[PDB]
């Protein structure tokens, strides 16, 4: 791997990469950060603690023009796997956690393509506040949310957007949580009915506030009441 | 970012983040302390502890971190990782779990006049003696006592954060309301030492009334 | 700031936190140890563990951390990270399932004379013989043995700060009353 060794030397030792600085030509520009969320598995919804535990893979996509290279000058290399702490990162956190775990769990490698695109898919176990409506229990449905934002950067410095996919040369935003139809194992008590994604911008907040922008992934989940039916309700009613 | 990099190079020259900013010996660092309550997570009566999620609001001045925007491309503000600058050692003294510190250091905002604003998140478990006499038709008085752990009053002077409202800030739209507790009063107070090793405190009080419908139905 | 920055830079130039901080190796590091009890968190009778919130005030003199204030703008005291200097390795000998040593490395207050005061917090989980014969009218006597784990009395001497633990900032418990307290 003499070629990517030379490429890393060219990117970080020859051009003087400073990961503390955002990838912008001027300070007033904002770094566009595209976010998508894949739900690996819904671990649980604890009603007493009012806590949703989820396993999620957070896809980050942004552009760092300092990490560009011509492939045919470096052995036709088109992609690199670099440590995430070797390159500026748009530090997104789960704002509405309720255990103090703001950050992703496994800081995996970033993938950097020759045209300057940085792709990053950290997985994470998240424990988030989900207030519980008990009115129709055990025939209840809940409305949990995973609210992602940046506390280190504000809307002036990064712009959050949804991931954009393509079909037949037509672009569309990914406005839902991604679930693999084959690999996803459904929770034994909760069925996902709706799973939208939204970019929320608060017009009242100033642009230099971390609360100006967020991306929220919502889970509308219906309880499967068979356990409670069989074990509690029929005996109690009879 | 070349201008921002140049400004960072200027600001970090000769700077020791472990040294308190005092231009002259005897100068005190004024630290304004405020609190934003994102969520009242719980009040555990068995363990006698209030679990809260908050954002601190700490403001002070570090004269070393001042600059003239005219000579730095009109840059009037910077965002700098908190570990890179001197921080007041402000902690929750009355924590119940041994955790004194904030949940995430994040970044401070530094203005050209040297004003530093820092709003770290914190998940705190604070000691609250429970008045059990009228449980479950009870109201509690759970305090959050914030103070410098090391610096004394002759080095760091505290004041209540305001812009003057002496209260915990609760954003109406985004606040995660608790299903069992109603916040009646939420003031904040600067507590002076009893009249040199002495330390002030900033105490945020949460007077909360239980909503006892569960016990009416079930008991 | 500038004076203190220069002082802190010069103090740690040839400093070693490995060796004991004495002019001569035949001397003994005199450490004053005072326990402050902030709260009696729990008395677990089944597992015989008493959980307490404490401040472990430790005072000694570092011979090499001295300066003349006149040379540094009159700076007479500073605060420095505790991880940078030699410290006594006090351990709770009868620790049950908590931490054996101090894990919260708070700043030390250093005077120009070399006097160091270090007052870290800790959650002591100590193993205590629990006599349940008279429960719920039972009286307990739970101790906290503290000592330098790796240093003997010929190289480090520990002395109590006071005959009694400091209960000035003790929070009143809703299940226990401290009838007596004493350090030996």
């Amino acid at each position: 791997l003499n070629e990517e060794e030379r490429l890393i030397r060219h990117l970080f030792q020859e051009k003087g990469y400073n990961k503390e600085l955002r990838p912008v030509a001027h300070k007033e520009e904002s770094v566009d950060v595209a976010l998508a969320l894949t739900l690996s598995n819904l671990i649980s919804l604890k009603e007493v603690e009012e806590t949703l535990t989820t396993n999620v893979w957070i896809e980050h996509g942004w552009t760092d023009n300092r990490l560009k290279w011509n492939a045919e000058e470096f052995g036709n290399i088109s992609v690199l796997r670099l440590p995430p702490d070797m390159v500026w990162l748009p530090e997104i956190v789960l704002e509405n956690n309720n255990d103090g775990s703001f950050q992703i769990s496994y800081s995996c490698n970033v993938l950097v393509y020759h045209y300057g695109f940085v792709y990053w898919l950290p997985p994470a176990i998240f424990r988030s506040s989900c207030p519980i409506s008990v009115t129709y229990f055990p025939f209840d449905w809940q409305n949990c949310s995973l609210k992602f934002s940046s506390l280190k950067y504000t809307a002036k410095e990064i712009t959050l957007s949804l991931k954009q996919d393509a079909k037949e040369n037509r672009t569309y935003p990914v406005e839902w949580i991604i679930i693999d139809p084959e690999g996803f194992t459904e929770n034994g008590e909760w069925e996902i009915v709706h799973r939208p994604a939204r970019v929320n911008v608060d017009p009242r907040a100033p642009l230099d506030s971390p609360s100006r922008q967020d991306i929220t992934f919502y889970l509308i989940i219906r309880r499967k009441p068979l356990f409670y039916i069989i074990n509690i309700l029929v005996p109690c009613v009879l | 970012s070349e201008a921002e990099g140049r400004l960072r190079e200027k600001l970090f020259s000769g700077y020791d983040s472990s040294v308190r900013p005092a231009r002259e010996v005897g100068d005190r660092v004024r630290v304004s302390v405020g609190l934003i309550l994102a969520q009242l997570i719980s009040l555990n009566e068995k363990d006698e502890e209030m679990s809260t999620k908050v954002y601190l609001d700490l403001e002070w001045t570090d004269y070393r971190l001042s600059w003239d925007p005219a000579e730095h491309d009109g840059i009037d503000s910077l965002r700098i990782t908190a570990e890179s600058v001197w921080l007041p050692d402000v902690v929750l003294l009355n924590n119940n779990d041994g955790n004194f510190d904030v949940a995430l250091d994040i970044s401070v905002v530094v203005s050209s006049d040297g004003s530093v604003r820092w709003q770290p998140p914190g998940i705190y478990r604070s000691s609250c003696s429970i008045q059990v006499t009228y449980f479950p038709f009870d109201w509690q008085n759970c305090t959050m006592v914030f103070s410098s752990y090391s610096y004394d009053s002759s080095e760091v002077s505290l004041q209540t954060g305001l812009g003057g409202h002496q209260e915990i800030h609760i954003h109406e739209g985004t606040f995660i309301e608790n299903g069992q507790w109603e916040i009646i009063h939420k003031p904040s107070r600067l507590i002076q030492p009893p009249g040199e090793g002495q330390r002030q405190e900033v105490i945020f009080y949460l007077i909360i009334r239980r909503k006892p419908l569960f016990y009416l139905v079930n008991v | 700031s500038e004076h203190e920055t220069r002082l802190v830079a010069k103090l740690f130039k040839d400093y070693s936190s490995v060796v004991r901080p004495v002019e001569d190796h035949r001397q003994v590091v005199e450490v004053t140890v005072g326990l402050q009890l902030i709260q009696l968190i729990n008395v677990d009778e089944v597992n015989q563990i008493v959980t307490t919130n404490v401040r472990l005030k430790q005072q000694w003199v570092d011979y090499n951390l001295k300066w003349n204030p006149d040379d540094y703008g009159g700076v007479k005291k500073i605060h420095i990270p505790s991880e940078k200097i030699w410290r006594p390795d006090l351990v709770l000998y009868n620790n049950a399932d908590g931490d054996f040593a101090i894990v919260k490395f708070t700043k030390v207050l250093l005077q120009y004379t070399g006097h160091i005061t270090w007052t870290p917090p800790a959650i002591f989980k100590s193993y205590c013989e629990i006599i349940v014969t008279h429960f719920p009218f039972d009286e307990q006597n739970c101790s906290m043995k503290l000592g330098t784990w790796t240093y003997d009395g010929s190289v480090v001497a520990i002395n109590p700060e006071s005959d009694q633990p400091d209960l000035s900032n003790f929070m009143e418990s809703g299940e226990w009353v401290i009838k007596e307290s004493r350090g030996w």
Partner: antibody, heavy 124, light 108 residues
């Protein structure tokens, strides 16, 4: 035992490039600002560059600004100086020097330890 | 361009005292450091902050700073003190400034 071994110096034509390296041992590499100081043959000492972990900042003298790049190895305790567009004025013994402070600058800033250096000769 | 000024050469007999000066505008308000470079050897810090001595440096080397002059004093000149002595300071506008070194010659 503090030790600074410089390498990568040698002969290069004018306008060429060269990467000097300085392997450091015996001290915490991240607790001290690192520096490159050059000495042309028969001439005095001249500070070239400094790298500070405080804020991740780099500093260069004017004559080498835009041409030289100081960096550190991501994993190993190694300091790099990538030099480009080398002139005959850059011929010198380049020493890698450790500072007393983790930060660059301030009145107290001085080089408490020096390596033996590497000779860089720029000639056709 | 703070321009520390040093004398190119200082000559003294064995056993006498050599005084190597470094001139500058209000240098008494700055911290002056002194490095010794033997022939074909790396420089060695011999004084820092105008008077302090690193461990392993002989006590016969001392420093002073006042007004517009800093001084390095080498007493009891031995046969192995031949070296180039450089003064050094830091300035906010000029970065690291070295002086034009002073060669010490023993007058035997």
């Amino acid at each position: 035992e503090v030790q600074l071994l410089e390498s990568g110096g040698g002969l290069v034509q004018p306008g060429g490039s060269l990467r000097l390296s300085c392997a450091a041992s015996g001290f915490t590499f991240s607790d001290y600002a690192m520096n490159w100081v050059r000495q042309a043959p028969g001439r005095g000492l001249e500070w070239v560059s400094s790298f500070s972990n405080s804020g991740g900042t780099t500093y260069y003298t004017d004559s080498v600004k835009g041409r030289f790049t100081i960096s550190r190895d991501y994993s190993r305790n190694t300091l790099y100086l990538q030099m480009n567009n080398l002139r005959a004025e850059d011929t010198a013994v380049y020493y890698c020097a450790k500072a007393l402070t983790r930060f660059y600058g301030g009145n107290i800033y001085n080089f408490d330890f020096w390596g033996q250096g590497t000779l860089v000769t720029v000639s056709s | 361009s703070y321009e520390l000024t040093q004398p190119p050469s200082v000559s003294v007999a064995p056993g006498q005292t050599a005084r190597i000066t470094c001139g500058g505008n209000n240098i008494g308000s700055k911290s002056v450091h002194w490095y010794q470079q033997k022939p074909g050897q790396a420089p060695v810090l011999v004084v820092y902050d105008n008077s302090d001595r690193p461990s392993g440096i002989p006590e016969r080397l001392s420093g002073s700073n006042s007004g517009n002059t800093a001084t390095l004093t080498i007493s009891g000149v031995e046969a192995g003190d031949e070296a180039d002595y450089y003064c050094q300071v830091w300035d906010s506008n000029s970065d690291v400034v070295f002086g034009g070194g002073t060669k010490l010659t023993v007058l035997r």
